[PDB]
A paper describes a structure:
From these four complexes, the photosystem II (PSII) complex catalyses light-driven water oxidation and provides the electrons used for carbon fixation. PSII is a homodimer with a molecular mass of ~500 kDa, each monomer contains cofactors such as chlorophylls (Chls), quinones, carotenoids, and lipids which are coordinated by at least 20 protein subunits. The eukaryotic reaction centre is a dimer surrounded by tightly bound monomeric light-harvesting complexes (LHCs) and trimeric LHCII complexes. In this work, PSII was isolated from the halotolerant green alga Dunaliella salina.
Initial classification of the dataset showed that approximately 20% of the particle population were in a stacked PSII configuration, containing two PSII dimers facing each other on their stromal side. The stacked PSII dataset refined to a 3.68 Å map after applying multibody refinement, with each dimer defined as a rigid body. Subsequently, the stacked particles were classified according to the higher quality PSII dimer, and two distinct populations of stacked PSII dimers were obtained, as observed for the unstacked PSII: one in the C2S2COMP conformation solved to 3.36 Å, and the other in the C2S2STR conformation solved to 3.84 Å. In several regions, this value decreases to approximately 10 Å, owing to PSII stromal loops in core subunits and LHCs protruding into the space between the two dimers. The rotation axis of C2S2COMP appears to be broad region containing the N-termini stromal loops of D2 and CP29 on one dimer, and the stromal loop connecting D2 helices IV and V, CP43 N-terminus, and the C-termini of CP43, CP47, and PsbI on the opposite dimer.
Author numbering:
A (entry chain A): 9 to 344
B (entry chain W): 60 to 103
C (entry chain M): 3 to 33
D (entry chain D): 304 to 352
E (entry chain D): 204 to 253
F (entry chain Z): 1 to 61
G (entry chain T): 1 to 30
H (entry chain V): 2 to 33
Write the structure that this text describes.
């Protein structure tokens, strides 16, 4: 009947006429994401130096402390806190909240909730638009990777100080320390993931080139070929069967996608399932399952070890390992 | 002690409630949202 | 490189933005 | 700035140290033509480990 | 490379979640016949959604 | 007594192999289930007899 | 002094994103 | 090794038994 | 079976063809339960064939024998295995039971009735009969409540369960007077999952474990009776979806939750997953290395209360952020670890210096050394140690394997829940096949998006 | 400092309750399609 | 090791874990045999 | 909270509350102080909890003063379980000697302006001479970082490069106090201990304490700062 206050608020929230859809997953996604955005921007601008390692030496991380855009990074929570929940209200003051790594753990918790509700909001808008609902499933792969690097790896290793720092050189630091400790390069799940981005780029170039190579002539040479398409037209704007013929006599006549829906399913599923596999690889290496270990596999008849490519990889790994936490180790085994 | 803290880390408090005012405001906010949701019913 | 870098970045902001603004204002003038 | 301030480290300086560790621990076995018979006391490391 | 893998996944997902019916069957792959002059998916619905 | 246990268990092994290769074959055979009722009944019966026999002989062996 | 320029460049990109979202050329649907 | 030979005969007997069921159902009438 | 023409479902979605075929659906389920029981029995027999008694069970790649030994079968004081026969019994019983279940599944899948409502109306159901579906749900809650009370009976009257907190280093114990206090039981449930709290992973005594099982068994039986004797209320009807795919999606979300929590139990918990059987936990190994080197550097004539590290924060002992005395080094991140060989050495201020000096025990120090050498770090070739080590130790912890695989399964099952929640919603809505192409909702809305 | 915790608890509880009762308010009936 | 009565049955114990993987592969075999209808 | 009921509480009842960082408070006994029996004593479990942290600064108009700080670290500031032996005389003269225990605790504070002040709050090697109302003495203050500490550019005394290798041409002249010379010189402190609320029945003492000690000198990069620490203390005799 549409008179009540909850009715007005509810139809406003589920309204598909808003410039940006809000929805019920949006009533969580919007405040969590603005919280994470505000804290991330303020921390990237002027966060005081954060003690990542727990050993009374901080990493600066903020632009106002002499960092450029490549170096600047929201530094993770302290190693002393571990997986303990560390809100602002739990800290004695904002200043030591900052020094122990509070902004990071805040931004990561809000980013988790924001991407989860972004996925829910994607499903919701597809439901309200009569769509099919699996764009949320396709988006679950970058969400899986984000959870794997920001929360699942800290749970497996025992501290948010092992999470990815929110920055560029901090990300590179995470990758190098991670390979040093777990050998991600020789992990089959990371191999599938690398194949996923390489394939996503390959089939993106392939799909774009085959569609652009078959666009039907509608405009003149002095106009953009894009002007041959008008938004909302029902005609097919390219020659799908001709692109099939070209692809077939280029690679395999019979092993070519003769269905456009098959082609788009492969386009959707290949990088998504591979990012699922690499996100799960990061999760497996959170619980220390690690990559392939072929260090001193090959030996001669005398039993003397022959170095191999995996052994050169291992020497690089020892180089990476003896530099991460240059002063935080008291014991030889890296069980932390 | 050199300062004052809420010192509620650990100890496993229900919903992280260290003073009962937090539980009362959780109860109040869910209760009033349920109240508006209930008075605005018999609709659609 | 503290002020030479600033003038390099300043010119990189201005010249392509100005060229793009030429072209866009020219387009939007003609409907 | 890091050279003139013994307290200023960033993830950038951490990456530089990691890179140097890679170079010194990788060179002897990766570039055998250089015959780098480096003693283990000059290889840069962290603590313990 | 990351944006291209994103483009691959997001384009495939968008096309297959904006498909037109042409159905009478729960499998959608058999609703496509490649000698037709009509689009299979709603570019309008996709544009509105994104 | 362990010899009887091994003989009965090996018999159970062959009987279970015959059930594996035969029960789906008999069931999905076109109108073969009705005239193989005696065979399936005897096979399951001797299978259970062997199971409980091996179970008892485990106590004596 | 470099930090001023970095903040300018970053919020400039943010302003470009704001304008490209809320001040776009609408789809004409004709 | 006797144990190895029994392991391989058990493996071959099991691996054959599945497609043996399918082949016997394919040649013995149908309803598969 | 059916084909694409008669159902619209391709072969790679063939099980959807049996969504509305109750008898074949039942057959698929019974055959599947036959597979689960079959794997349990077959892998149990494989493990007891490949079990070795002079080694602990975490060194031989075992995942089911630790589970049986936690119930108090074949192990005595110290967690030492005394009889592999109970494990043999469980394996063979499961294998025979799987034969029976597999016959039931094959029968009901191949020659069983196609739909059960025309001949057996008690088992006959359609996905919209909410009364019948809640009856089935109620029957299954009584079944699961009897399972939980079966564990309660095992702990109370049938030999007890293995207690790693028993004095001396762990022993099987008859649980007497399990905690029945609702405050204590549900405080675990409403607890935060972060450090020091850990949600319900931080359950640390079989008293709490068995009491929660009494509690959950009684709730399951009561809710089962309630579901048999009720129907969902109109708010539940207006909020939920009532398709079989929807019920599947609800189950998928719940079991994905269960898989994630199982991963965290296997990784952190040491009272339901004793380290004598599963190997040390992640915190356990690092705290063990710190504790061992602490006692060696007491034996080499040095004061550990003093002697700050290269950062001046303490080589062996330091202060946690909450004020107690903890082990120094990076293992400070695991300062909230609780195990049977640290609690007798822990005072109100955390670790007590005089107790660390005088009240050491030989069993604690060898347990700590063995946990130090067998840390849950290994490669997927089963090469123990960090990724920079040598192929010399063939060991990966069962905690690692279980937490790894069950996080993978919990994540993929969450994704399956996404897929099925979406497909159930769009199927109840009507556009599971696509847009109408003539009544497209997007063309009926205002411009400017 | 406790005040900030009380206010944030109010914020989170309010938004979570809004989410919960928004989905409880007959969401599977807000499809655009027939039925 | 299995009890002293069941020691010669260890080889046919050793192959039993892989049987569910054989079951999913058998489902694919049957679908290939019915021509993937 | 006394030593009695603190030991009556288990580890699970104290964890996460901050009771473990707080020295025992005595309510029994008399504040008469002088009624302790004189003689040679051997104290065990010397405990000291600070209640204030202030740092001497340089005001730009020319003033020298201590201004309050904000504690960067969490509850890691007290010292507990320190042994020793003292001599108390009938005329009131005491000496104080501390030998073992957790006799140091690293602590970082902010001066207003967001400058980090790390220091190693120690009481080690304390030899305080005086009366029972107040006795004062000197204590050893170690540097902060050990010789094996590596700075951001490597370096350090035992382990390190001793030169900025990050630029292959500038490795001499002005940066002597950054790379060419590293200093781990231990400092010296000054503390004034007062005794109040003595329990002579069970042989325990308490009161307040005062201390001035150097902050982190680090490697010679900056001049050290001087920290004025006030707080309570506790000690059991025999
Ligand atoms: C609100 C919910 C927030 C959930 C995410 C926040 C991180 C939770 C966490 O810190 O996780 C860890 C906790 C376990 O907490 C640990 O709990 C432990 C309890 O064990 C203690 O007690 C034990 C008793 O035997 C032992 O003695 C042990 O040694 C001792 O330490 C300790 O307290 C640790 O400090 C503590 O960190 O897991 C748990 O509580 C179980 C929670 C479910 C697991 C979820 C995993 C996947 C999560 C998200 C995936 C998202 C998917 C969708 C998007 C994609
Ligand atoms: C396209 C078409 C479709 C594609 C399908 C692809 C599906 C699968 C493809 C992978 C094929 C698997 C490789 C087979 C070889 C193998 O496996 O070989 C391994 C073993 C057999 O080798 C034995 O492996 C043993 C492993 O050590 C174990 O036992 C040791 C005893 O010393 C130690 O105790 C050690 O701790 C313990 O781990 C020992 O090394 C033995 O010496 C060795 O003979 O097979 C086994 O275990 C059996 C396998 C069981 C593991 C799988 C289930 C558990 C899943 C965990 C997920 C975790 C992580 C995911 C990835 C990351
Ligand atoms: C847990 C695995 C599992 C289970 C229990 C089932 C069960 C079922 N499927 Mg299915 N399927 C599966 C996996 C599974 N499937 C997978 C992975 C795929 C993708 C390849 C398919 C694709 C698929 C399709 C396309 C179809 C089914 C169909 C069916 C149903 C009838 C099959 C039939 O009668 O046709 C005949 C099958 C046979 C004659 C083969 C007989 C072989 C038997 C069953 C193997 C067991 C033998 C065993 C070793 C002996 C044990 C007996 C005793 C000793 C214990 C049935 C309930 C059909 C259906 O929907 O029904 C309407 C159908 O159309 N499935
Ligand atoms: C998920 C539960 C689970 C867990 C935690 C374990 C854990 C373990 N198993 Mg076990 N097992 C399981 C299930 C499980 N298993 C199942 C279902 C079977 C039946 C096939 C077996 C059969 C089995 C045997 C026969 C043996 C073990 C053994 C072991 C131990 C060593 C594992 C190893 O090193 O192998 C290697 C690790 C792998 C092979 C990981 C493979 C990675 C995934 C699974 C495959 C890749 C997927 C691909 C990329 C995606 C494709 C998608 C699509 C196209 C299909 C270890 C403790 C061994 C043991 O120690 O005995 C005591 C052993 O002999 N398992
Ligand atoms: C896993 C078994 C199971 C399942 C599948 C169900 C399923 C269902 N139950 Mg049910 N129930 C169960 C066990 C189960 N119940 C048991 C064991 C009991 C005995 C205690 C009950 C007692 C019960 C009652 C009294 C009612 C239901 C009702 C319902 C229906 C609607 C519930 C709902 O709205 O969803 C989800 C519910 C909510 C989102 C609101 C519940 C409030 C919270 C979530 C309860 C948990 C409290 C806890 C603090 C929350 C945080 C826990 C988390 C941190 C782990 C639904 C079909 C209702 C019904 O329709 O009657 C027929 C109803 O009246 N059940
Ligand atoms: C490849 C498939 C696969 C395999 C091989 C396994 C294997 C395993 N899983 Mg698992 N799981 C899987 C898939 C798989 N899972 C999937 C897809 C999910 C959803 C994401 C899960 C979710 C899951 C959870 C939540 C848990 C496991 C657990 C386990 C382990 C113990 C199994 C168990 O005892 O369960 C339970 C057995 C039953 C439910 C049957 C009832 C048994 C009765 C009630 C026992 C009563 C006996 C009583 C105590 C004795 C007294 C007798 C008398 C004297 C009274 C085991 C190694 C457990 C674990 O160890 O966590 C790591 C566990 O908690 N899994
Ligand atoms: C109890 C859980 C459960 C149940 C009952 C179902 C049931 C159903 N699903 Mg489903 N699904 C689930 C979980 C479940 N799913 C999970 C966890 C996922 C992962 C995201 C999916 C993803 C999925 C998709 C994409 C589809 C279904 C579909 C279907 C329907 C037809 C299934 C079929 O015949 O496919 C045939 C069986 C096969 C093709 C065999 C699959 C082979 C897999 C890929 C190999 C995996 C093995 C490998 C070793 C796993 C390792 C992973 C990692 C842990 C190492 C059916 C009603 C279809 C549908 O919606 O129909 C309406 C369909 O499109 N499901
Ligand atoms: C998708 C996949 C899901 C997979 C796994 C799910 C993970 C975990 C499942 C829940 C485990 C923890 C449940 C208890 C939660 C709790 O008690 O919080 C209580 C905690 C406690 O909060 C803290 O407690 C501390 C002591 O431990 C102190 O008291 C702190 O002061 C206090 O902040 O608060 C939180 O962590 C956040 C609560 C709000 C969460 C908002 C997100 C919810 C989103 C949707 C809910 C919809 C319905
Ligand atoms: C941290 C402390 C709080 C923790 C709360 C945990 C205990 C409660 C958890 C179980 C709640 C039962 C859920 C079933 C109803 C939810 C679905 C619904 O929407 O049910 C819909 C249904 C439609 O009739 O409603 C009904 O059946 C009516 C049944 C629900 C009645 C709710 C009353 C609870 C008391 C709160 C009201 C105070 C109200 C106003 C506050 C004013 C403040 C100024
Ligand atoms: C439906 C279907 C299907 C199927 C499924 C299933 C699942 C089945 C099954 C089944 C089953 C699940 C079965 C089982 C079985 C069992 C048996 C057959 C047994 C036995 C026994 C024995 C003989 C043993 C012996 C022994 C002992 C006692 C001890 C020592 C050792 C030994 C081994 C000697 C498929 C998928 C294909 C496809 C689709 C359709
Ligand atoms: C045994 C044991 C124990 C116990 C346990 C327990 C007792 C548990 C429980 C629990 C519980 C008691 C739970 C509950 C729950 C619930 C849930 C989990 C839910 C849900 C759902 C959802 C998610 C929803 C959604 C929605 C909404 C929001 C509304 C309606 C509609 C919809 C659907 C939309 C302990 C730990 C002590 C110890 C150890 C062992
Ligand atoms: Cl590093
Ligand atoms: Cl360490
Ligand atoms: Fe396309
Ligand atoms: Na180091």
């Amino acid at each position: 009947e549409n008179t009540s206050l909850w009715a007005r608020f509810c139809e406003w929230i589920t309204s598909t006429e808003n410039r940006l859809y809000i929805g019920w997953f949006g009533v969580i996604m919007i405040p969590t994401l603005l919280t994470a955005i505000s804290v991330y921007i303020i921390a990237f601008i002027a966060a005081p130096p954060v003690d990542i390692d727990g050993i009374r030496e901080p990493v600066s991380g903020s632009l106002l402390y002499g960092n450029n855009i490549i170096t600047g990074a929201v530094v993770p929570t302290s190693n002393a806190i571990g997986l303990h929940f560390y809100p602002i209200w739990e800290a004695a003051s904002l200043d030591e909240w900052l020094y122990n790594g509070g902004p990071y753990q805040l931004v990561v918790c809000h980013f988790f909730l924001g991407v989860c509700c972004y996925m829910g909001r994607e499903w919701e808008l597809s439901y309200r638009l009569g769509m099919r609902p699996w764009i949320a499933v396709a988006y679950s792969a970058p969400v899986a990777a984000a959870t794997a690097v920001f929360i699942i790896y800290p749970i497996g290793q025992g501290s948010f100080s092992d999470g990815m720092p929110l920055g560029i050189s901090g990300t590179f630091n995470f990758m190098i320390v991670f390979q040093a400790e777990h050998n991600i390069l020789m992990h089959p799940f990371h191999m599938f993931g690398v194949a996923g981005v390489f394939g996503g780029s390959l089939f993106s170039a392939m799909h774009g080139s085959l569609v652009t190579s078959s666009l039907i002539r509608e405009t003149t040479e002095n106009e953009s070929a894009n002007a041959g398409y008008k938004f909302g037209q029902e005609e097919e704007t390219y020659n799908i069967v001709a692109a099939h013929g070209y692809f077939g006599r280029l690679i395999f006549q019979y092993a070519s996608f003769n269905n456009s829906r098959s082609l788009h399913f492969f386009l959707a599923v290949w990088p998504v399932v591979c990012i699922w596999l690499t996100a799960l690889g990061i999760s497996t290496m959170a619980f220390n399952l690690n990559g392939f270990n072929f260090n001193q596999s090959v030996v001669d008849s005398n039993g003397r070890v022959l170095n191999t490519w995996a052994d050169i990889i291992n020497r690089a790994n020892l180089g990476m390992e003896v530099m991460h936490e240059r002063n935080a180790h008291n014991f030889p085994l890296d069980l932390a | 002690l050199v300062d004052d803290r809420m010192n509620g880390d650990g100890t496993g408090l229900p919903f992280g409630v260290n003073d009962g005012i937090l539980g009362w405001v959780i109860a109040g906010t869910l209760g009033t949202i349920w109240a508006i949701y209930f008075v605005s019913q018999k609709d659609l | 490189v503290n002020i030479l870098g600033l003038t390099a970045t300043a010119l990189f902001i201005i010249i392509p933005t100005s060229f793009l603004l030429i072209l866009y204002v020219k387009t939007a003038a003609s409907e | 700035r890091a050279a003139e301030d013994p307290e200023f480290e960033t993830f950038y300086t951490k990456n530089i140290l990691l890179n140097e560790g890679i170079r010194a621990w990788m060179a002897a076995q990766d570039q055998p033509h250089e015959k780098l018979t480096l003693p283990e006391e000059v290889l840069p490391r962290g603590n313990a480990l | 490379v990351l944006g291209a893998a994103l483009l691959c996944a997001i384009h495939g997902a968008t096309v297959e979640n904006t498909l037109f019916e042409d159905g009478d069957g729960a499998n959608t792959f058999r609703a496509f016949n490649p000698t037709q002059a009509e689009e299979t998916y709603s570019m309008v619905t996709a544009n509105r959604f994104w | 007594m362990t010899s009887i246990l091994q003989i009965a268990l090996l018999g159970l092994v062959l009987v279970s192999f015959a059930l594996v290769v035969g029960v789906p074959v008999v069931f999905a055979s076109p109108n073969g289930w009705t005239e193989n009722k005696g065979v399936v009944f005897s096979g399951l019966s001797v299978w259970f007899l062997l199971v409980f026999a091996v179970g008892v002989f485990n106590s004596f062996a | 002094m470099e930090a001023l320029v970095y903040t300018f460049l970053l919020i400039g990109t943010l302003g470009i994103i704001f304008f490209s979202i809320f001040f776009r050329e609408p789809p004409r649907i004709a | 090794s006797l144990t190895l030979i029994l392991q391989l005969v058990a493996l071959f007997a099991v691996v054959a038994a599945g497609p043996l069921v399918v082949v016997l159902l394919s040649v013995r009438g149908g309803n598969l | 079976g059916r084909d694409q023409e008669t159902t619209g479902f391709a072969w790679w979605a063939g099980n959807a063809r049996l969504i509305n075929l109750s008898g074949k659906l039942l057959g698929a389920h019974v055959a599947h339960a036959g597979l689960i029981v079959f794997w349990a029995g077959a892998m149990n027999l494989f493990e007891v064939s490949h079990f070795v008694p002079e080694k602990p069970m975490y060194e031989q790649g075992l995942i089911l024998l630790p589970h049986i030994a936690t119930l108090g079968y074949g192990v005595g004081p110290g967690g030492e295995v005394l009889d592999t026969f109970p494990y043999f019994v469980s394996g063979v019983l499961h294998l025979i039971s799987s034969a029976v279940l597999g016959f039931g599944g094959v029968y009901h899948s191949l020659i069983g009735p196609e739909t059960l409502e025309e001949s057996y109306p008690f088992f006959g159901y359609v996905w919209k009969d909410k009364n019948k579906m809640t009856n089935i749900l109620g029957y299954h809650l009584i079944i699961l409540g009897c399972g939980a009370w079966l564990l309660v009976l095992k702990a109370l009257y049938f030999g007890g369960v293995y207690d790693t907190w028993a004095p001396g280093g762990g022993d099987v114990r008859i649980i007497s007077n399990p905690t029945t206090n609702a405050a204590i039981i549900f405080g675990y449930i409403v607890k935060s999952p972060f450090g020091g709290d850990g949600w319900i992973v931080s359950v640390d005594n079989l008293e709490d474990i068995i009491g929660g099982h009494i509690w959950i068994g009684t709730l399951c039986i009561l809710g089962g009776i309630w579901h048999i004797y009720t129907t969902p209320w109109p708010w539940a009807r207006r909020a939920f979806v009532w398709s079989g795919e929807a019920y599947l999606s609800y189950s998928l979300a719940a079991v994905s939750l269960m898989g994630f929590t199982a991963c965290c139990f296997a990784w952190f918990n040491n009272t339901a997953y004793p380290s004598e059987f599963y190997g040390p936990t992640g915190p356990e190994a690092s705290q063990a290395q710190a504790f061992t080197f602490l006692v060696r550097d007491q034996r080499l004539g040095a004061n550990v209360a003093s002697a700050q590290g290269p950062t001046g924060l303490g080589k062996y002992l330091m202060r946690s952020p909450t004020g107690e005395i903890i082990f120094g080094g990076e293992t400070m991140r695991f300062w909230d670890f609780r195990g049977p060989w640290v609690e007798p050495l822990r005072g109100p201020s955390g670790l007590d210096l005089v107790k660390l000096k005088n009240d050491i025990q030989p069993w604690q120090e060898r347990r700590a050394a063995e946990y130090m050498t067998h840390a849950p770090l290994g490669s997927l070739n089963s090469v123990g140690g960090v990724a920079t080590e040598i192929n010399a130790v063939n060991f990966v912890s069962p905690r690692s394997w279980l937490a790894t695989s069950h996080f993978c399964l919990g994540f993929f099952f969450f994704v399956g829940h996404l897929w099925h929640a979406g497909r159930a919603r769009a199927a109840a809505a009507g556009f599971e096949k696509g847009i109408d192409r003539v009544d497209e909702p997007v063309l009926s809305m205002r411009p400017l998006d | 400092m406790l005040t900030l915790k009380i206010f944030v608890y109010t914020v989170v509880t309010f938004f979570v309750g809004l989410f919960i009762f928004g989905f409880l308010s007959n969401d599977p009936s807000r499809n655009p399609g027939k039925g | 090791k299995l009890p002293e009565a069941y020691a010669p049955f260890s080889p046919i114990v050793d192959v039993l874990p892989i049987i569910p993987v054989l079951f999913i592969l058998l489902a694919f075999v049957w679908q290939a045999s019915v021509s993937f209808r | 909270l006394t030593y009695d009921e603190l030991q009556g509480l288990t580890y699970l009842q104290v964890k996460g509350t901050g009771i473990a960082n707080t020295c025992p408070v005595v309510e029994q006994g008399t504040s008469n102080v002088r009624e302790l029996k004189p003689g040679d004593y051997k104290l065990e479990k010397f405990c000291m909890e600070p209640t204030s942290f202030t740092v001497k600064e340089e005001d730009a108009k020319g003033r020298e003063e201590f201004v309050k700080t904000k504690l960067l670290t969490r509850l890691t500031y007290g010292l507990d379980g320190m042994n020793g032996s003292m001599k108390i005389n009938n005329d009131g003269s005491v000496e104080f000697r501390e030998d073992e225990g957790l006799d140091y605790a690293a602590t970082t504070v902010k001066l207003p302006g967001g400058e980090y002040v790390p220091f190693l709050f120690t009481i080690k090697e304390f030899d305080g001479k005086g009366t029972l109302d107040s006795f004062s003495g000197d204590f050893l203050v170690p540097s902060y970082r050990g010789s094996t500490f590596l700075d951001p550019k490597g370096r350090g005394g035992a382990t390190g490069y001793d030169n900025a290798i990050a630029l292959p041409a500038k490795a001499d002249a002005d940066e002597i106090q950054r790379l060419n010379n590293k200093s781990y010189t231990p400092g010296k402190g000054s503390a004034v201990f007062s005794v109040a609320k003595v329990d002579t029945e069970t042989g325990e003492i308490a009161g307040v304490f005062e201390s001035i000690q150097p902050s982190d000198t680090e490697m010679g990069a900056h001049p050290a700062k001087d920290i004025k620490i006030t707080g309570l203390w506790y000690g059991q005799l025999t």
